RNA sequence: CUGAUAACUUCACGGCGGGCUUGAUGUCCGCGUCUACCUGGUGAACUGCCGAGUAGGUAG
């Protein structure tokens, strides 16, 4: 109950929304609040709590074959009665759709926009600091957006970016 | 359009007498049934009042 001051702005792929509510009040990673959400889904007046995920990934509402209709219903009351001033939460969800293209590639709706195929990277992506955080990575071609020369693969020592290993995917002119 | 055409078989009645199936008998020996199993009431018919009362009544 009462997640204090949902702040955020647009242009986000919903994964740092749980990270920004993780860095407040003093909490480790997202396994606690993520269990306390699915515990609250296991609490009063709910029917579909069993399939709400467990890990860093898979908060995505197309990662299950048939919990897609359960994930949005999970995401319905995950904004209303748990936030003062319930924010723009719904619509950030990268869903799936019924549309296709002509070369038989699966269409995928974010809030109004369609990616070419639901394959693009899904793993081992670059990342740049000093925002919170992006909408456009884990895709084929979205690199810099104004400030350039920022690939940031972490061959040197641990904890270069100051976030706390939540999103932080790093392992050890016409563009 | 028939081996064609027609056609009363009827009346009467005592089966009876007698009678010992018997004697004897050993069905026995042996025996591993077992392994694995979800029945599924969400919150849902809630709170008083009189009477000594696990009886009885009485409210919205």
Contact A118/A96 with Cβ under 8 angstroms? yes
Residue A104 Cβ under 7 A from any strand B atom: no
CA atoms within 13 A on the CB side of A155: 1
Query: What was the structure determination method?
Result: cryo-EM
Q: Which nucleotide is nearest to A45 (CA to C1')?
A: B43
Q: In 3D, which of A80, A79, A81 has the Cα closest to residue A92?
A: A79
Q: Which nucleotide is nearest to A47 (CA to C1')?
A: B42
Beta-bridge mates of residue A156 = none
Q: Which nucleotide is nearest to A46 (CA to C1')?
A: B42
Strand B close residues, chain A 40-69, CB < 7 angstroms: 44-45, 47
Q: In 3D, which of A124, A107, A40, A99 has the Cα closest to residue A75?
A: A40
Q: What is the dihedral of CA A163, A29, A27, A13, to 10 degrees?
A: 70
Which residues, 6+ apart, have CB-to-CB distance to A170 below 8 Å? A127, A152, A153, A154, A160, A161
């Amino acid at each position: 109950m009462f997640l204090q001051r949902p702040k955020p702005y647009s242009d986000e792929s919903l994964e740092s929304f749980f990270i920004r509510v993780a860095n407040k009040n003093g909490y480790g990673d997202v396994h606690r609040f993520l269990e306390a959400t699915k515990r609250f889904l296991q609490d009063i007046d709910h029917n579909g709590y069993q399939t709400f995920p467990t890990d860093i990934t898979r908060i995505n509402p197309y990662s299950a074959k048939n919990s897609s209709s359960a994930r949005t219903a999970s995401f319905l009351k995950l904004a209303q009665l748990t936030f003062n001033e319930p924010p723009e939460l719904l619509g950030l969800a990268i869903n799936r759709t019924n549309m296709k293209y002509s070369p038989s590639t699966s269409a995928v709706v974010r809030g109004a926009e369609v990616f070419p195929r639901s394959l693009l990277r899904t793993h081992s992506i670059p990342c740049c600091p000093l925002c919170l955080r992006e909408n456009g990575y884990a895709s084929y071609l979205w690199h810099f957006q104004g400030y350039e020369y920022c690939h940031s693969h972490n061959v040197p020592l641990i904890t270069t970016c100051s976030c706390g290993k939540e999103f932080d995917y790093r392992v050890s002119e016409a563009a």
